[PDB]
Design an enzyme around this catalytic site. Structure first.
Site, PDB file in Angstrom:
ATOM      1  N   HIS A 512      -2.789   7.661  -6.342  1.00 47.15           N
ATOM      2  CA  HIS A 512      -3.902   7.785  -5.411  1.00 47.15           C
ATOM      3  C   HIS A 512      -4.985   6.817  -5.800  1.00 47.15           C
ATOM      4  O   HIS A 512      -6.204   7.135  -5.813  1.00 47.15           O
ATOM      5  CB  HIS A 512      -4.414   9.224  -5.479  1.00 47.15           C
ATOM      6  CG  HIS A 512      -3.462  10.204  -4.904  1.00 47.15           C
ATOM      7  ND1 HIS A 512      -3.488  11.506  -5.220  1.00 47.15           N
ATOM      8  CD2 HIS A 512      -2.395  10.043  -4.041  1.00 47.15           C
ATOM      9  CE1 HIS A 512      -2.520  12.165  -4.569  1.00 47.15           C
ATOM     10  NE2 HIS A 512      -1.843  11.291  -3.843  1.00 47.15           N
ATOM     11  N   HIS A 556      -5.698  13.831  -2.079  1.00 48.36           N
ATOM     12  CA  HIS A 556      -4.775  12.756  -1.841  1.00 48.36           C
ATOM     13  C   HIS A 556      -5.419  11.744  -0.968  1.00 48.36           C
ATOM     14  O   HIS A 556      -6.178  12.126  -0.069  1.00 48.36           O
ATOM     15  CB  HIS A 556      -3.494  13.341  -1.148  1.00 48.36           C
ATOM     16  CG  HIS A 556      -2.793  14.438  -1.911  1.00 48.36           C
ATOM     17  ND1 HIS A 556      -1.480  14.338  -2.280  1.00 48.36           N
ATOM     18  CD2 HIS A 556      -3.250  15.658  -2.453  1.00 48.36           C
ATOM     19  CE1 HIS A 556      -1.132  15.455  -2.966  1.00 48.36           C
ATOM     20  NE2 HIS A 556      -2.204  16.227  -3.114  1.00 48.36           N
TER      21      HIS A 556
HETATM   22  C1  LIG Z   1       3.563   5.712  -2.295  1.00 50.28           C
HETATM   23  C2  LIG Z   1       3.012   7.149  -2.297  1.00 50.28           C
HETATM   24  C3  LIG Z   1       1.696   7.386  -1.874  1.00 50.28           C
HETATM   25  C4  LIG Z   1       1.175   8.706  -1.802  1.00 50.28           C
HETATM   26  C5  LIG Z   1       2.050   9.812  -1.917  1.00 50.28           C
HETATM   27  C6  LIG Z   1       3.392   9.555  -2.267  1.00 50.28           C
HETATM   28  C7  LIG Z   1       3.862   8.239  -2.490  1.00 50.28           C
HETATM   29  C8  LIG Z   1       5.142   8.053  -3.303  1.00 50.28           C
HETATM   30  N1  LIG Z   1       1.689  11.093  -1.456  1.00 50.28           N
HETATM   31  C9  LIG Z   1       0.268  11.297  -1.023  1.00 50.28           C
HETATM   32  O1  LIG Z   1      -0.426  11.965  -1.997  1.00 50.28           O
HETATM   33  C10 LIG Z   1       0.317  12.031   0.190  1.00 50.28           C
HETATM   34  O2  LIG Z   1       1.119  13.090   0.215  1.00 50.28           O
HETATM   35  N2  LIG Z   1      -0.874  12.152   0.887  1.00 50.28           N
HETATM   36  C11 LIG Z   1      -1.860  11.223   0.695  1.00 50.28           C
HETATM   37  O3  LIG Z   1      -2.988  11.465   1.141  1.00 50.28           O
HETATM   38  N3  LIG Z   1      -1.724  10.164  -0.161  1.00 50.28           N
HETATM   39  C12 LIG Z   1      -0.467  10.066  -0.731  1.00 50.28           C
HETATM   40  N4  LIG Z   1      -0.145   8.891  -1.290  1.00 50.28           N
HETATM   41  C13 LIG Z   1      -1.173   7.814  -1.363  1.00 50.28           C
HETATM   42  C14 LIG Z   1      -1.548   7.153  -0.028  1.00 50.28           C
HETATM   43  O4  LIG Z   1      -0.373   7.023   0.803  1.00 50.28           O
HETATM   44  C15 LIG Z   1      -2.175   5.777  -0.330  1.00 50.28           C
HETATM   45  O5  LIG Z   1      -3.349   5.946  -1.151  1.00 50.28           O
HETATM   46  C16 LIG Z   1      -2.694   5.044   0.910  1.00 50.28           C
HETATM   47  O6  LIG Z   1      -1.584   5.066   1.819  1.00 50.28           O
HETATM   48  C17 LIG Z   1      -3.038   3.577   0.623  1.00 50.28           C
HETATM   49  O7  LIG Z   1      -3.267   2.800   1.822  1.00 50.28           O
HETATM   50  P1  LIG Z   1      -3.661   1.241   1.759  1.00 50.28           P
HETATM   51  O8  LIG Z   1      -4.774   1.019   0.766  1.00 50.28           O
HETATM   52  O9  LIG Z   1      -3.782   0.705   3.210  1.00 50.28           O
HETATM   53  O10 LIG Z   1      -2.360   0.617   1.060  1.00 50.28           O
HETATM   54  P2  LIG Z   1      -0.843   0.574   1.613  1.00 50.28           P
HETATM   55  O11 LIG Z   1      -0.592   1.653   2.590  1.00 50.28           O
HETATM   56  O12 LIG Z   1       0.036   0.506   0.392  1.00 50.28           O
HETATM   57  O13 LIG Z   1      -0.767  -0.802   2.386  1.00 50.28           O
HETATM   58  C18 LIG Z   1      -0.654  -2.125   1.831  1.00 50.28           C
HETATM   59  C19 LIG Z   1       0.355  -2.855   2.666  1.00 50.28           C
HETATM   60  O14 LIG Z   1       0.247  -4.212   2.190  1.00 50.28           O
HETATM   61  C20 LIG Z   1       1.540  -4.762   2.120  1.00 50.28           C
HETATM   62  N5  LIG Z   1       1.542  -5.912   1.242  1.00 50.28           N
HETATM   63  C21 LIG Z   1       1.150  -5.922  -0.100  1.00 50.28           C
HETATM   64  N6  LIG Z   1       1.009  -7.173  -0.561  1.00 50.28           N
HETATM   65  C22 LIG Z   1       1.232  -7.984   0.529  1.00 50.28           C
HETATM   66  C23 LIG Z   1       1.156  -9.342   0.699  1.00 50.28           C
HETATM   67  N7  LIG Z   1       0.818 -10.134  -0.349  1.00 50.28           N
HETATM   68  N8  LIG Z   1       1.363  -9.831   1.918  1.00 50.28           N
HETATM   69  C24 LIG Z   1       1.662  -9.050   2.958  1.00 50.28           C
HETATM   70  N9  LIG Z   1       1.727  -7.694   2.866  1.00 50.28           N
HETATM   71  C25 LIG Z   1       1.482  -7.221   1.643  1.00 50.28           C
HETATM   72  C26 LIG Z   1       2.397  -3.621   1.656  1.00 50.28           C
HETATM   73  O15 LIG Z   1       3.795  -3.813   1.730  1.00 50.28           O
HETATM   74  C27 LIG Z   1       1.812  -2.445   2.451  1.00 50.28           C
HETATM   75  O16 LIG Z   1       2.481  -2.186   3.669  1.00 50.28           O
END
Ligand SMILES: *Cc1cc2c(cc1C)N[C@]1(O)C(=O)NC(=O)N=C1N2C[C@H](O)[C@H](O)[C@H](O)COP(=O)(O)OP(=O)(O)OC[C@H]1O[C@@H](n2cnc3c(N)ncnc32)[C@H](O)[C@@H]1O
Ligand SMILES: *[C@@H]1O[C@H](CO)[C@@H](O[C@@H]2O[C@H](CO)[C@@H](O)[C@H](O)[C@H]2NC(C)=O)[C@H](O)[C@H]1NC(C)=O
Ligand SMILES: *[C@@H]1O[C@H](CO)[C@@H](O)[C@H](O)[C@H]1NC(C)=O
Length: 577
Positions: A512, A556
């Site tokens: 998180h 979360h």
């Molecule tokens: C992975 C995970 C996350 C969480 C849980 C379980 C698992 C295994 N469970 C939770 O606790 C849940 O049940 N409820 C929640 O409230 N939170 C959970 N949880 C965390 C939560 O999902 C997370 O904090 C949040 O989604 C983050 O969102 P954000 O900051 O927008 O990040 P991402 O969703 O990861 O998006 C990034 C996006 O970027 C792409 N990517 C990365 N690097 C690049 C580059 N260089 N170029 C293009 N794209 C890139 C990623 O692939 C991703 O899609």
């Protein structure tokens, strides 16, 4: 939106107003909201594939199969964590459109009002304070009956829910004895474990029925399904493509409105220029990496891997705020939550019912506030309404799990249990701050992730107390003879020393994470973005994702990310009238 599988598929002669790097939780909110202006064109560049036909991601009960090692995971691991016996931890993150909202456990928790007020104070923007942000959270929410139309009377307070928004929230639950034993425990031990009607009312302390991002058809509700799907053709989504850097449009300036991208490390770099801005939305791990690889970061760190520093900001990649968690397992004689998964998948496929329709195999969360005398240090929480500890009840099973159990963690003695009650105990305010840094200057090289786990003593002390708190819950009269001794940690492990040894072997990251490109007031001596989400010292460049959120909430983090992303979207759009 129109999705393109490869850069060469993009239409010629299109100039985009906004380019969003990272088609994740926040990234798809921003792209989708900005696109509400029919005169704007938005390109999303996402490293992973489309979520479309990513079948397992649709099924709420398969979520637990999607973390570390899964076909859609980044497979990030940390540097050795010297506070955890030198272990390298997984840091599961989704590589797929919708990002972590496509792979997560669907839990919908807003955090306490103190969290929002804490952030509002740090950032200097009362629009993020609870009273100001709650209406926006409700507007963005679409609470729904589940597919079977189960009564959720007494499970939620409809008072605190929006019904007309984007993101589906529901609360389907199994009918198991555990439900009632939990509720009766709230009457016995009401001081520590009161019943909580709606943990999303700003005051989450107590035992609440979990709410999930699951739609009315028993499918996961992600940012792709909730936001992206209904957009028009002015949203273009390029998948399977890595944003490598952001680049100055002028070439010696700090107008970082250009993006560079490539399909792999052995492919041509391509460039596009946004007419207005680049919005970096790569999340807590990737966004700092993109910025450092772009010359925006700690000069010495960048120098040492051969990158020319364009903006010297040593806060880039610092202040990673996350949550440490451990499994706890009790011997129990309660009925298992296990089932034949193939059979259940056929059921979900054929009817959208059954256990895979639901967001978890148990139905509740507990949020525990420790008294001042069980805090071995200054109170790390956001305020009096904030819990220190979460219990996330996982399952009851006669089979020792691997999920939530580190590789070399000692397992419960086979003869010590009939079935196992597994739950996670989470230190929601883990004060030890981590960092993201570079191994080298290749965007395809994974960054170095340190969680700095247990650097500060209060973090392990709070988790110890969280374990003791769980012990008190399952000691209740309601639970007698149903949930018995601890078996992970062993029942004989009772001392601070012995629980600490257990915790060094058992603790893992709750993923998180926030804070690596922290939002701070304009003029503050630290941080990376201003309250307008713009990178300090630049034009044409914002960061909108978990990285800006100053510290992790008692929650979360998906909802806080959605709400920050909605907040950013509104103010970005407003800035162009
Ligand atoms: C992975 C995970 C996350 C969480 C849980 C379980 C698992 C295994 N469970 C939770 O606790 C849940 O049940 N409820 C929640 O409230 N939170 C959970 N949880 C965390 C939560 O999902 C997370 O904090 C949040 O989604 C983050 O969102 P954000 O900051 O927008 O990040 P991402 O969703 O990861 O998006 C990034 C996006 O970027 C792409 N990517 C990365 N690097 C690049 C580059 N260089 N170029 C293009 N794209 C890139 C990623 O692939 C991703 O899609
Ligand atoms: C991590 O975040 C903290 C803020 O929570 C920053 O701490 C500030 O540091 C500045 C610069 O030294 C001080 O002037 C402030 O008084 C500090 N504020 C607080 C609340 O402690 C810190 O600089 C951040 N660290 C990095 C490397 O970004
Ligand atoms: C993560 O590892 C799994 C298991 O080997 C694999 O299927 C997947 O492609 C890996 N992820 C990446 C980004 O390579």
């Amino acid at each position: 939106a129109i999705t393109y599988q490869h850069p060469d598929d993009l239409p010629s002669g299109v100039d985009y107003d906004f380019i969003v790097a990272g088609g994740g939780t926040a990234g798809l909110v921003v792209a989708s909201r900005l696109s509400e202006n029919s005169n704007w064109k938005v390109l999303v560049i996402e490293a992973g594939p489309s979520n479309k036909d990513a079948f397992v991601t649709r099924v709420p009960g398969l979520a637990s199969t999607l973390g570390a090692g899964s076909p859609i995971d980044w497979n990030y691991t940390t540097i050795p964590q010297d506070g955890l016996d030198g272990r390298s931890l997984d840091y599961p993150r989704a590589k797929i459109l919708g990002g972590c909202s496509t792979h997560n456990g669907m839990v919908y928790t807003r955090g306490s009002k103190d969290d929002w007020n804490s952030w509002a104070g740090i950032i200097g923007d009362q629009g993020l304070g609870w009273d100001s942000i709650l209406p926006a959270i409700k507007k963005a929410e679409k609470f729904t009956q589940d597919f079977t139309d189960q009564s959720v009377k007494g499970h939620i307070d409809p008072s605190v829910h929006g019904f007309d928004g984007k993101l589906s929230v529901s609360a389907a639950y199994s009918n198991i004895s555990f439900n009632d034993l939990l509720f009766e425990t709230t009457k016995e031990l009401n001081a520590e474990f009161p019943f909580k009607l709606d943990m999303n009312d700003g005051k989450p302390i107590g035992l609440g029925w979990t709410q999930y991002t699951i739609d009315n058809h028993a499918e996961r509700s992600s940012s792709a399904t909730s936001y992206l799907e209904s957009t028009g053709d002015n949203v273009h989504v390029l998948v399977n493509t890595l944003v490598t850097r952001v680049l100055s449009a002028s070439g010696n300036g700090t107008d970082f409105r250009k993006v560079e991208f490539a399909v792999d490390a052995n492919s041509p770099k391509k460039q596009l220029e946004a007419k207005k801005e680049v919005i970096v939305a790569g999340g807590v791990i990737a966004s700092p990496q993109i910025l450092m690889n772009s010359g925006i970061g700690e000069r010495k760190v960048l120098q040492a891997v051969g990158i020319d520093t364009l903006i010297d900001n040593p806060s880039v990649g610092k202040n990673l705020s996350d949550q440490g968690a451990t499994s706890v397992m009790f011997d129990t004689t309660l009925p298992s939550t296990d089932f034949d998964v193939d059979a259940a998948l056929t059921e979900w496929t054929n009817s959208h019912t059954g256990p895979l329709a639901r967001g978890a195999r148990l139905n509740h969360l507990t949020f525990v506030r420790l008294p001042d005398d069980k805090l071995n240090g200054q109170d790390p929480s956001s305020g009096k309404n904030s819990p220190h500890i979460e219990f996330q009840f996982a399952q009851i099973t006669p089979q020792v799990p691997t999920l939530g159990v580190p590789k070399q963690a000692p397992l419960p003695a086979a003869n010590s249990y009939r079935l196992l009650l597994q739950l996670a105990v989470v230190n929601l305010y883990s004060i030890s701050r981590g960092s993201i840094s570079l191994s080298d200057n290749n965007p395809f090289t994974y960054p170095l992730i340190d969680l700095n786990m247990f650097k500060e003593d209060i973090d392990i002390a709070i988790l110890r107390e969280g374990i003791r708190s769980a012990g008190r819950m399952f000691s209740s009269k309601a639970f007698k003879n149903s949930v018995n001794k601890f078996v992970y940690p062993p029942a004989d492990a009772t001392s601070d020393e012995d629980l600490d040894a257990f915790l060094r072997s058992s603790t893992f990251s709750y993923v998180h994470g926030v804070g690596t490109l922290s939002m701070s007031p304009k003029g503050a001596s630290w941080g990376v973005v201003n309250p307008d989400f713009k990178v300090k010292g630049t034009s044409g460049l914002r960061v909108v994702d978990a990285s800006v959120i100053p510290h992790a909430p008692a929650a979360h983090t998906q909802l806080p990310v959605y709400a920050f992303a909605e907040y950013a979207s509104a103010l970005i759009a407003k800035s162009y009238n």
